[PDB]
């Protein structure tokens, strides 16, 4: 399916690349500090592992649905053949960038001074259980080539890992950047739905729908706590 309105298509591209930038720029400050220090002391090792799980899972869904004519046909067979694919180029760019950045972090953890830091049993357990389940789903889908079903599991895994990021977490510049990308990724989906006259993209990409809303709600909650509720 193609865009109807020229201004709505341009709006959707501008809000998408704003979402890409506000969420990709935050990877560099820690990475630069770690290389200069030649150490990872101060970094949460559990969070690095949980984020590699989340970013690889979202990346699988975005790259596959964006580039595979085969998986795109499965999408059309499920939500409608007049539907627009709900994965934008900025989603693909965000995902690949977030995996490379997280992989650089892991390489830094491996080469650099670690101090008394170590991934917790509870975090290793979450990751092992999540990866095991994903491997169970890869083998169930492999004979029937159920690739839309498989990457929708990968997308639900990122929604689980997104809940793990915010729920325990419950200064302003980083919150504002995170909130901007959540609102920009949500608004992107709205603009698409308005133009196509269809809300199916919210169901076909329930991972992006929840990733954006979990981010918005939780960042609003943190801003409400640091300024209204207590100080």
């Amino acid at each position, epitope marked *: 399916a*193609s865009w109807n*309105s020229i201004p709505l298509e341009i709006s959707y591209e501008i809000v998408g690349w704003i979402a890409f930038a506000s969420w990709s720029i935050s990877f560099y400050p820690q990475l630069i500090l770690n290389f200069r220090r030649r150490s990872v002391v101060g970094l949460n090792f559990d969070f690095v592992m949980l984020n590699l799980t989340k970013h690889s899972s979202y990346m699988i869904y975005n790259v596959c649905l964006y580039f595979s004519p085969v998986i*795109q046909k499965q999408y059309f067979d499920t939500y409608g053949d007049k539907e627009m694919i709900p994965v934008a180029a900025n989603d693909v760019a965000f995902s690949i960038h977030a995996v490379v950045m997280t992989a650089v972090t892991l390489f830094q953890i491996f080469i650099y001074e670690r101090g008394p830091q170590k991934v917790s049993r509870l975090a290793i357990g979450i990751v092992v259980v999540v990866w095991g389940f994903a491997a169970i789903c890869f083998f169930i889908a492999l004979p029937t080539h159920s690739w839309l079903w498989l990457i929708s599991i990968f997308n639900s895994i990122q929604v689980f890992m997104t809940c793990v990021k915010y729920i325990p977490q419950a200064s302003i510049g980083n919150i504002l950047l995170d909130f901007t990308g959540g609102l920009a990724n949500y608004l992107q989906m709205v603009i698409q739905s308005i133009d196509q006259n269809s809300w199916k993209n919210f169901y076909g990409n329930m991972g992006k729908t929840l990733l954006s809303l979990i981010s918005i709600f939780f960042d609003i909650l943190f801003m409400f706590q640091h300024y209204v509720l207590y100080p």
Partner: nanobody
Amino acid sequence: QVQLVESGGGLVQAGGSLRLSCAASGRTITPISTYVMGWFRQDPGKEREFVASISWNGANTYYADSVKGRFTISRDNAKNTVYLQMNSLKPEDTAVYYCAADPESHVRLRLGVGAYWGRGTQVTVSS
């Protein structure tokens, strides 16, 4: 791969009418009725220039400032056909008119970087 076949080109007197048609067909992952369709034109040593475009919903039409008000674009999604009704023709309108299509972007089709192009139909305007 989508084939775009133009029709309707010919000689016409200044101030007259000519109606171009373009039939779209080919093996596609998305239905051709969901494609952006349009028209471009070209004069000998010049770059191809935008003429008109129509969204797959049929609600958003775009025109070049020079043809605005005289040329009307319409489409028939049951036939996969796009039309250009050219009224009030001027000698300057003499050019090859190319049909154009894009499976996803109205920006790319308007910008002239659309995926599919027809072979062209010569339109000649006498005096």
